[PDB]
């Protein structure tokens, strides 16, 4: 096992920073602050971060560096009875690949669309517009903004699809963009972390160059301080309501991606004695710091929109793809040198996503390269075949009704699947492997054991932190619908199978090899709870 290693430590730090910092840092965190009491939201956000997020983030980083294997092999060597956890985590990463990159394609599509003297999404008098178009965002459902109609009627053409059944034609301009992202991903994850860890230099750092420019541009706009007000002004009344605590908890969990399989894979290439504790604290902070900085970039322009462009703050302080593809471009198209802002903004969105794609794909490539040597020998071939399956199936999301299909995956691919997977990860680590056996492994790496704080969080808070999410996530459940469309009950089932195809691997694999070893019930519940290294 002469495993290779990051050519430099910045390769690892930027790879981790890059995987963590993505569009969610821009189109969800600032919105949650504005919605849940401004500055006061940082109280439950920081608590959930210190008590649930960073612990789990730290845990997987240490496991990866210590056990020095991908997700499948790692959990197998940790507790065999739960080797299925590694399979669930790899399958979930596989599913989210089918839709995460098409959002990067949208960014390139808008990027190539900004090479013009006047941006197309500015006015309401184009072939794609309707008589109900209006210049900027409003609050009546049947009257979209110019930028909304451009995104909807020209880029997506979603208006020509009656639902998930009616997909329609394949927009080959989107398919070309999707290919350009898989080509970029290929010659990046091409020959391992040797080049991967270098491409991450541009993709992980470039967003801070643009955030810096847009931050100055935004704070120097009439009314930007008004935006900073809607962003932060405290209202600690929100702290009392439990909806903001589950909001903070959920955002913290999904923004760090602890136990998703990629932090494991990335850490497994570190040197055994790397101070992975200093790494977990450093990168986890840089992640939340980037969200905070981004909120100023967004709401500085949001206030400008509400003060000079005359719109209601509630009509533009949105979240999700609508914020970056409709609301913000609209404001960009209204300021001097708009072509410049549009070009670097859409380029930022692209590089924000690429990093996170790399991480999800590496989680798969590494996990398989460590469990089936046929793949490790032919790396360039495997990913070539993987991305091809991605692109080909991805053409179903370059269709006109692709959003309906893509929206389905978003709510089912990893939504509850990853939560129950990480719950077992925490249960396995602390209770079946052992926190003392785990703390002992960390002592051998960094020279000191984790404090009792980190041990208490891995053993009791992390499982409660994750149930607190899954419980309130099931309580707020409602059938799948986008705008007026109600998904048919067969689609609602298709998602549950996607959700179950990963989670079932846990009990399924626990049943298969629970019968594949010889001996008594207890004699086998112990041959399958003895770690691999405790065998030499």
């Amino acid at each position: 096992d002469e495993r290779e290693t990051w050519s430099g430590k910045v390769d690892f730090l930027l790879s981790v920073i890059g995987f963590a910092v993505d569009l969610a840092n821009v189109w969800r965190f600032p919105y949650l602050c504005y919605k849940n009491g401004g500055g006061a939201f940082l109280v439950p956000y920081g608590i959930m971060l210190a008590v649930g997020g960073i612990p789990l983030f730290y845990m997987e980083l240490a496991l990866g560096q210590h056990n020095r294997k991908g997700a499948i092999t790692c959990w197998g060597r940790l507790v065999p009875l739960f080797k299925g956890i590694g399979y669930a985590v790899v399958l979930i990463a596989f599913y989210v690949g089918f839709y995460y990159n098409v959002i990067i394609a949208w960014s390139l599509r808008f990027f190539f669309a900004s090479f013009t003297n006047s941006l197309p999404w500015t006015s309401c008098n184009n072939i794609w517009n309707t008589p109900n178009c209006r210049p900027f965002e409003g609050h009546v459902e049947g009257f979209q903004s110019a930028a909304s109609e451009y995104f909807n009627r020209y880029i997506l053409e979603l208006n020509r699809s009656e639902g998930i059944h009616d997909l329609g034609a394949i927009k080959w301009d989107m398919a070309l963009c999707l290919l350009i992202v898989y080509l970029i991903c290929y010659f990046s994850l091409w020959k391992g972390i040797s080049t991967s860890g270098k491409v991450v230099w541009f993709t992980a750092l470039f967003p801070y160059a643009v955030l810096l420019i847009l931050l100055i541009r935004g704070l120097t706009l009439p009314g930007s301080f008004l935006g900073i007000q809607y962003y932060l002004t405290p209202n600690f009344s929100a702290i009392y309501k439990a909806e903001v605590w589950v909001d903070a908890a959920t955002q913290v969990f999904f923004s760090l991606g602890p136990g998703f399989g990629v932090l494991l894979a990335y850490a497994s290439y570190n040197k055994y004695h790397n101070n992975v504790y200093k790494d977990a604290l450093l990168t986890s902070f840089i992640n939340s710091a980037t969200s905070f900085i981004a909120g100023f970039v967004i709401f500085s322009v949001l206030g400008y929109m509400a003060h000079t462009l005359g719109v209601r703050i509630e009509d533009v302080a949105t979240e999700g793809p609508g914020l970056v593809f409709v609301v913000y471009p609209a404001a960009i198209a209204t300021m001097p040198a708009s072509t410049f802002w549009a070009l670097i903004f859409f380029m930022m969105l692209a590089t924000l996503g690429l990093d996170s794609s790399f991480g999800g794909m590496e989680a798969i490539i590494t996990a398989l390269s460590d469990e089936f040597p046929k793949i490790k020998r032919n790396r360039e071939l495997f990913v070539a075949g993987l991305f091809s399956l991605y692109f080909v199936v991805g053409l179903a999301s370059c269709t006109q009704g692709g959003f309906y299909f893509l929206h389905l995956l978003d709510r089912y691919a990893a939504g509850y699947s990853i939560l129950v997977a990480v719950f077992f990860e925490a249960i396995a680590v602390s209770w079946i492997y052992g926190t003392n056996r785990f703390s002992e492994d960390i002592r051998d790496m960094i020279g000191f054991p984790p404090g009792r704080y980190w041990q208490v969080c891995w053993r009791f808070v992390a499982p409660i932190f994750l149930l607190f999410i899954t419980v309130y996530g099931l309580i707020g459940y409602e059938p799948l619908t986008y705008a007026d469309y109600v998904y048919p009950s067969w689609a609602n089932a298709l998602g549950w199978c996607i959700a179950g195809s990963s989670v079932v691997m846990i009990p399924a694999v626990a049943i298969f090899k629970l019968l594949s070893t010889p001996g008594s019930l207890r004699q086998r519940f112990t041959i399958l709870t003895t770690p691999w290294r405790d065998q030499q």
Partner: antibody, heavy 119, light 109 residues
Framework: EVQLVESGGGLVKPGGSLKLSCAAS????????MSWVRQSPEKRLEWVAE????????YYSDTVTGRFTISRDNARNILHLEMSSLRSEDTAMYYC????????????WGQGTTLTVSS | ENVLTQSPAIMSTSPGEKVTMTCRAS???????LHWYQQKSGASPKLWIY???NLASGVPARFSGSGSGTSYSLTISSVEAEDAATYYC?????????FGSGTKLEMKR
């Protein structure tokens, strides 16, 4: 409050074998790595072996590897050192030292137990 | 093996004077891993300074530490008779763990 007591060990003929013991009291023995450090009659400190908190990580000095075996009993809070094929060079006072955190060092030492290897 | 050499081997001092002793390693040692032990004639060693500069519990303030890389030093501000002992440095950053050759501090009369 913390106490370490070495015991066993006296005169042994070359090639022979002997077993040292260290009694721990005043702390959660199972939470701390332990090491043996010996001091030759020429008063030179030399580290010999270390065993981790749960005994799953063990390091030996090159000059002792293959002949000494360090072991642990977290149930009874005892540290052992099994020595075989001894030589006169092994003559020394053997210390039992607590050292969980590499960045803090050996924060507690025993009174020592003397091994004389001679024909 | 990282051999640590201490100088001087013996050194006399009259109470009140300032004493400095050096610990030179044959390979770079992380400052956070260099430690110092005091051993009185007839007793067992006692942890004295850890991470180059931190005094152990019970160590009076007249003791200080400093250094980095391959050169470290223990320094007594105003030496007292209760300081007569042998001082061993030690590195905890690489196996095998290695102690310095020691500096014996004797009193001048």
């Amino acid at each position: 409050e913390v106490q370490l007591v070495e015991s066993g060990g006296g005169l042994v003929k070359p090639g022979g074998s002997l077993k040292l013991s260290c009694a721990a009291s005043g702390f959660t023995f199972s939470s701390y790595a332990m090491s043996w450090v010996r001091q030759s009659p020429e008063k030179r400190l030399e580290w010999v072996a270390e065993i981790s908190s749960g005994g799953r990580y063990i390091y030996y000095s090159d000059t002792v590897t293959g002949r000494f075996t360090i072991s642990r009993d977290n149930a009874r809070n005892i540290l052992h050192l099994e020595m075989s094929s001894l030589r006169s060079e092994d003559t020394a006072m053997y210390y039992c030292a607590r050292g969980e955190v590499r960045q803090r060092g050996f924060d507690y030492w025993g009174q020592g137990t003397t091994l004389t290897v001679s024909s | 093996e990282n051999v640590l050499t201490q100088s001087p081997a013996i050194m006399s001092t009259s109470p009140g004077e300032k004493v400095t002793m050096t610990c030179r390693a044959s390979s770079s040692v992380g400052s956070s891993y260099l430690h110092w032990y005091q051993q009185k004639s007839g007793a067992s060693p006692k942890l004295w300074i850890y991470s180059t500069s931190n005094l152990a519990s019970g160590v009076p303030a007249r003791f200080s530490g400093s250094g980095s890389g391959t050169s470290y030093s223990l320094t007594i501000s105003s030496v007292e008779a209760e300081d007569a002992a042998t001082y061993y440095c030690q590195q905890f950053s690489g196996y095998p763990l290695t102690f310095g050759s020691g500096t014996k501090l004797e009193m001048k009369r």
